[PDB]
């Protein structure tokens, strides 16, 4: 019955190097409830072949999830994430 | 060795979508152990860590019955809790759980824990003692009375000590090779200015627990507290701006378990 | 490893 | 049928996996047999063993198995971890976190 604002985050498992393989990681945390729909984007729309982590809820019952995929850093990379705190989207980008 | 952790349970009442879904997850330190999901293709619990796969079907078949049991007690408990507050069955509510132990450097029993959660935050938690509970609602009292009658606290205390702990050490010795590592975080030092008139971070560490102190001054406004983050492999990762000629007296102090010395 | 008695609220 | 008099666990399957920038080794033999002891380095672990491989670490492992005479015989098997820890730990090479030093 209570809503808490989710903190969303696109970043890299390893420091990005031009042409070197890596993982895209969208880490979302602090939210409640756990109904969260996130999609990793690139330039337009492509990667619905997203892999996710399993649901957990930290220390103060605030959930945290990590959605990941494999890529090579170069092209834009962001995360569109919908939560129930508000019904207006959020697109957090991977800004080095 | 300042290393021990917990088990997590999540049950979500679906918007009239039949039966709740249930997530059983486990952990030793920041290293996760077991994976159960009720809408998973496997009605068994899966090992995602390799060093729990040294356990036989005696441990798997005997732990897949128990998690189903947890899913059932959850799926009934939510029916109760929503049944006795003020809800509609078209509604969707959430119940999250906790029980477990920690251990010190002598690997001996550090105090254990056990807490529950309704939609909100804290519902019922085992207090930092043995027989007791901490409740702050009204239904909380009736159910904690229900646990005062069943003599739950001590029968759970006999698990917090002697069952969670020896299994914890058993895990620490069967995965000794993967928990020898106090991965020290590697630092750089960068700058960026936008107006004519920085960054404190850690990159590769095994326990997530790190303090990153940012001269004799205290703060309240300038730093943005950020959460510690998974680097997706078992490692974790973790800013302040000042006038362009005066970012040159401060340093960032770091204390980590794998850091014998705090870094200037 | 898991807690073995069915706890109910 | 019979599980444990068979002289067949020579091929005890093994898998490699990246866990915290080290090559995690998992030697899985049969769980249909007790006393089939698996040994890798200086660690002995029943039917299934889990350790790590780094340059210098062993590339053989011992399997202790009782025979039809009731007597146990230990058999040395050579499987190269240098050929599966270099492949599993590939992204850790580009970023200089493996070998375990630095």
Radius of gyration of chain C: 7 Å
Helix content of chain C: under 10%
**Helix-strand sequence of chain D:** EEEEEEH
Radius of gyration from the alpha-carbon trace of chain D, in angstroms: 16 Å
Class by alpha and beta content of chain C: little secondary structure
GO molecular function (chain C): DNA binding; SH3 domain binding; zinc ion binding
GO cellular component, one term (chain C): host cell cytoplasm
Protein name (chain C): X protein
Family (chain C): Belongs to the deltaretrovirus Tax protein family.
What does this structure look like?
The complex is a heterotetramer of chains A (96), B (264), C (9) and D (102). Chain A is 0% helix and 42% strand. With 96 residues, chain A is an all-beta fold. Chain A has a 4-stranded antiparallel sheet with strand order 1-2-5-4, with no helix packed on it. Chain A has a 3-stranded antiparallel sheet with strand order 3-6-7, with no helix packed on it. Chain B folds into 2 domains: 1-181, MHC class I-like antigen recognition-like (Murine Class I Major Histocompatibility Complex, H2-DB, Chain A, domain 1), CATH 3.30.500; 182-263, Immunoglobulins (Immunoglobulin-like, Sandwich). In chain B, strands 4-3-2-1-5-6 form a 6-stranded antiparallel sheet. Chain B has a two-stranded antiparallel ribbon with strand order 7-8. The longest helix of chain B is centred in the first third of the chain and has 28 residues, at 57-84. Chain C has 9 residues and is mostly loops. Chain C has no helix or strand. The termini of chain C are far apart. Chain D has one domain (1-102): Immunoglobulin-like. Helix content of chain D is 4%, strand content 33%. Chain D is built from 1 helix and 6 strands, in the order ββββββα. Chain A binds chain B through residues 1-2, 7, 9, 11, 13-15, 23, 25, 27, 29-30, 32-34, 53-57, 60-61, 66, 68, and chain B through 8, 10, 12, 23, 25, 32, 35, 37, 92-94, 96, 117, 119-122, 203, 227, 229-233, 237. Chain A: Its main location: secreted. Chain A: One of its GO terms (biological process) is cellular response to iron(III) ion. Chain A: One of its GO terms (molecular function) is peptide antigen binding. Chain A: Residues 6-92 form the Ig-like C1-type domain. Chain A: This is Beta-2-microglobulin.
